[PDB]
């Protein structure tokens, strides 16, 4: 991926996240927890569904055409009737080879993108109350129960509430 999040600074995928594509795992004073992010999941799916709808069931209607298999040997114009059809098939075969290559390179880059978007979004909410440990993990420097974590997932986390407590833990020792 072009952002190096998926198969990058995040070491691997969570097989046990079965209700979403992207999400959170947390440890705090109440236990451990996991939750899918429905928003970043839905973004990726919609884009992929868009790709599908422009490729799938967009078929042409075609009726009488030219002949393409022949009993007798005829020479000049049968040469042309075969050359035309051969030229067409080779061209459509190129188009399909390229389309798939392009669409797949893109599908990978946009999925990598949504992962990085979620990260940066979360980093912005946490502000001075957390540091980036690597592996896609934040160290949060204050007591943050499941409600606190829920507010981060909701995007209503008020950093001023904990800022004093958090800056004290970061610049200790």
């Amino acid at each position: 991926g072009i952002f190096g999040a998926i198969a990058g600074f995040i070491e691997n995928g969570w097989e046990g996240m079965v209700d979403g594509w992207y999400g959170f795992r947390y440890q705090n004073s109440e236990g451990t927890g996991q939750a899918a992010d429905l928003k970043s999941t839905q973004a990726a799916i919609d884009q992929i569904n868009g790709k599908l709808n422009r490729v799938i069931e967009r078929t042409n209607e075609k009726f009488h055409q030219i002949e393409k298999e022949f009993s007798e040997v005829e020479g000049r114009i049968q040469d042309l009737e075969k050359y035309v059809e051969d030229t067409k098939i080779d061209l459509w075969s190129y188009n399909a080879e390229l389309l798939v290559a392009l669409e797949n390179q893109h599908t990978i880059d946009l999925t990598d993108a949504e992962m990085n978007k979620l990260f940066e979004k979360t980093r912005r909410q946490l502000r001075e109350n957390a540091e980036d440990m690597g592996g896609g993990c934040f160290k949060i420097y204050h007591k943050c129960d499941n409600a606190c974590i829920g507010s981060i997932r909701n995007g209503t986390y008020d950093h001023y509430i904990y800022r004093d407590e958090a800056l004290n833990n970061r610049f200790q020792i």
């Binding site: 996240m17 999400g23 669409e103």
Partner: protein, 317 residues
């Protein structure tokens, strides 16, 4: 007094490999096939109107080969010609056979309309043991074989205006005898001629006496020709011998119909795409079953498989 919040993505036990711009094989959580490579195995008949030619070629059904009489006023979206088809009437050739076959096939109908051509001084409705209709000698139902009446065969001069608003297809021919004795016996004149003309165009044909190979008892032959007469125009037929006269016109449509060669069984099912191998679904953008197709079909390509990724990069433990 602290907490860890890790972000991540999902993954599946066993993903599937795909091609990218930079990779031959890279694993993703899911993918979908874009090449239709299997077929139903039979031609579906509940989408388009498919007509089984059985033992008859489209051309024979047009001309009126006795054993093709079942097709007289038929019409189709797709006419299926079988490889076990055969001709069982007077031996014949059609210069530029493929073009007549294409024209009729596209029109999609054998709607014939007899017309009162005034053939005087000749005996009409000639027959042959090579074209039996029941126990009796007969001939192509849409063709009229003229021979001398009494002791003569005049210079025929007959016309028929096109007062309709569609193009009329007229099928006619000339008879080639097997000897000079046969030529003069049937037509009196030692040399035959047939000139079918419009105001814009014309076709003249001289017969060619002498034997050919034996076909159902006969060494003689006929050659089939056609003339398309436009609205407002006029058909004229001038001939002093060997004319195989037309009986009327076929009605030409500018239709979306066609013809196809296949030995595939025809059965109740639904599918808007037809190939010689059988019907195929059209959910995918491309196919690898056959370049010969009719209907709403995926595009034919050389590759039998192309996987489009419908998920992210799969990275398990």
């Amino acid at each position: 007094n602290t907490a860890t919040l890790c972000l991540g993505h999902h993954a599946v036990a066993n993903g599937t490999l795909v091609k990218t711009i930079t990779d031959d094989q890279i694993e993703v959580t899911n993918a979908t096939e874009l090449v239709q490579s299997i077929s139903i195995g039979k031609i579906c008949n509940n989408s388009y109107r498919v007509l089984d030619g059985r033992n008859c070629t489209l051309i024979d059904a047009m001309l009126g080969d006795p054993h093709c009489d079942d097709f007289q006023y038929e019409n189709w979206d797709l006419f299926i010609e079988r490889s076990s088809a055969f001709s069982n009437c007077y031996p014949y050739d059609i210069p530029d056979y493929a073009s007549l076959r294409s024209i009729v096939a596209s029109s999609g109908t054998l709607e014939f309309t007899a017309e009162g051509f005034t053939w005087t001084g000749v005996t009409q409705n000639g027959g042959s043991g090579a074209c039996k209709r029941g126990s009796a000698d007969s001939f192509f139902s849409r063709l009229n074989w003229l021979t001398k009446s009494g002791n003569s065969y005049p210079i025929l001069n007959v016309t028929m205006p096109n007062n309709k608003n569609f193009d009329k297809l007229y099928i006619w021919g000339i008879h080639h005898p097997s000897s000079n004795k046969e030529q003069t016996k049937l037509y009196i004149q030692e040399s035959g001629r047939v000139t079918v003309s419009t105001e814009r165009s014309q076709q003249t044909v001289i017969p060619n006496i002498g034997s050919r190979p034996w076909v159902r008892g006969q060494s003689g032959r006929i050659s089939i020709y056609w003339t398309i007469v436009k609205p407002g125009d006029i058909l004229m037929i001038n001939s002093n011998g060997n004319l195989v006269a037309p009986r009327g016109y076929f009605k030409l449509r500018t239709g979306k119909s066609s013809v196809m060669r296949s030995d595939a069984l025809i059965d109740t099912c639904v599918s808007e795409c037809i190939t010689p191998n059988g019907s195929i679904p059209n959910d995918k953008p491309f196919q690898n079953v056959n370049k010969i197709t009719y209907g709403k079909c995926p595009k034919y390509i050389r590759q039998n498989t192309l996987k489009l990724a419908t998920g992210m990069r799969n990275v398990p433990e």
